[PDB]
């Protein structure tokens, strides 16, 4: 079980990657920065590599934002009222609100960061969750969705096992880590909506990588 | 399609 989705081997992907003026553009930059280092953490993910080409190009363009959000959210367990970007900058909610993204920004703080904090989500659990998000069989175009589903299911496999002999006194650990996933989806969807708004109003400097993930083929 | 990601993935 803990065998084909070697938990501790995802960590070696979590870790093998984990060391302005306007809030939005600081966020959109820490984004485009994190994109590159995402394509990495993936390419270093237990089997992700093997899967077809045009397929990895899909699986990622599919959950890049939720993958990234889950990350910076985890990274911010420590900080009090805001997130901490990959660019080292702390972004407070007051900052968010001035930019009119106060409410989504807040959903991130309470439904994600706070949750992850109030439950000690570890760096492994995180990685599985992101693994799961990474392995989304329903992604359109995927050539042989069959395979991706295999992978993902194999993650619930380890993750539950993993949760099993590591926080044994906690029965529902597993459910509880998975129940942040819908919120991640919910929030990610919204964020995505705002970015398209910041784009088709052409004001925010969106760098090039983030710009590709933001443009259809 | 899309370059940078398509590529980058590889190497």
């Amino acid at each position: 079980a803990n065998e084909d989705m070697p938990v501790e081997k995802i960590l070696e992907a979590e870790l093998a990657v984990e060391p302005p003026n306007d809030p939005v553009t600081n966020i959109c930059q820490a984004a485009d920065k994190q994109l590159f280092t995402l394509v990495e953490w993936a390419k270093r993910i237990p089997h992700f590599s093997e899967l077809p080409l045009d397929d990895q190009v899909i699986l990622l363009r599919a959950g890049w934002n939720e993958l990234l959000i889950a990350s910076f959210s985890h990274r911010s367990i420590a900080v009090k009222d805001g997130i901490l970007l990959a660019t080292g900058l702390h972004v407070h909610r007051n900052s968010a609100h001035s930019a009119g993204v106060g409410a989504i920004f807040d959903r991130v703080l309470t439904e994600l960061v706070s949750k992850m904090r109030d439950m000690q989500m570890d760096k492994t659990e995180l990685g599985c969750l992101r693994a799961i998000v990474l392995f989304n069989p329903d992604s359109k175009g995927l050539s042989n969705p069959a395979e991706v589903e295999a992978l993902r299911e194999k993650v619930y496999a380890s993750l539950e096992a993993y949760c099993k002999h590591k926080y044994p006194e906690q029965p529902g650990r597993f459910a509880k880590l998975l129940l942040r996933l819908p919120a991640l989806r919910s929030i990610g969807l919204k964020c995505l909506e705002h970015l398209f708004f910041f784009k088709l109003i052409g004001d925010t400097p969106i760098d090039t990588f983030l710009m590709e993930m933001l443009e259809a083929p | 399609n899309h370059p940078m990601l398509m590529n980058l993935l590889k190497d």
Binding site: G100, G172, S186, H194 | -
Partner: protein, 245 residues
């Protein structure tokens, strides 16, 4: 365990607030069955009524949930306000007939995809039909669908929760019941617990575009949006990025 007095109970509330597809005698209609349009008024009128009824039945199912009752009203209304459209989608999608590509409403009314649209699903349509199919492979049962429904309803994230932690642990056994039950019922496929638990994620995707349809639709309709539908599928506080006043 005795954690099944609860399972057992939910399965009863679901079954009594939502009739099966196999026990319902179906009738069809031809109005708006040939092709899509902004919105067939007859269809809209039937559909809306059922909807109203169903929202009531969901509240009924709600109240029957262990502990739910004992909970703040604004918190209850909130939990329900937040989950209603979620449960509606789950429910209707379990009334899906693959072969015929149709959904059947509580009175047996049986619409094909196009009618499902012309009746008010509009844009939201091929999306709900996807979930409908995404569901078949799971071969869920009443108790499972009852539990799942109860887990969307008893959710502690919903904004404006007075006793979240109460609401959080209130749904703690539900998560356990659903795990045990799916596992005991289908030993060879233990990956069906997370698999069905996670349907909640595509679910919320749809109920999003849902509340959006509630209004973009209560436009094309010459009259008014039925009371309860409104009092349930509305109230969300302006869309961002909107700056502070």
């Amino acid at each position: 365990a005795e954690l099944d007095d609860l399972t057992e109970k939910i399965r009863k509330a679901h079954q009594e607030t939502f009739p099966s597809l196999c026990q319902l005698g179906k009738y069809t209609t031809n109005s708006s069955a040939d092709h899509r349009v902004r919105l067939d008024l007859g269809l809209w009128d039937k559909f809306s009524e059922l909807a109203t009824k169903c929202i009531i039945k969901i509240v009924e199912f709600a109240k029957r949930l262990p502990g739910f009752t004992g909970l703040t009203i604004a918190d209850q209304i909130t939990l329900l306000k937040a989950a209603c459209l979620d449960i509606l989608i789950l429910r209707i999608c379990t009334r899906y007939t693959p072969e015929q590509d149709t959904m059947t409403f509580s009175d047996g009314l049986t619409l094909n995809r196009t009618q499902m649209h012309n009746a008010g699903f509009g844009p939201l349509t091929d999306l709900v039909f996807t979930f409908a199919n995404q569901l078949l492979p799971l071969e869920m049962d009443d108790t499972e669908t009852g539990l799942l429904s109860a887990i969307c309803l008893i959710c502690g994230d919903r904004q404006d929760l007075e006793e979240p932690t109460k609401v959080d642990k209130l749904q703690e056994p539900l998560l356990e019941a659903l795990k045990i039950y799916i596992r005991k019922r289908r030993p060879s496929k233990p990956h069906m617990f997370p698999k069905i638990l996670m349907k909640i994620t595509d679910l919320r995707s749809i109920s999003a575009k849902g509340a959006e349809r509630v209004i973009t639709l209560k436009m094309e309709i010459p009259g008014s949006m039925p009371p309860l539908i409104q009092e349930m599928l509305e109230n969300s506080e302006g869309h961002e990025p909107l700056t502070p006043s």
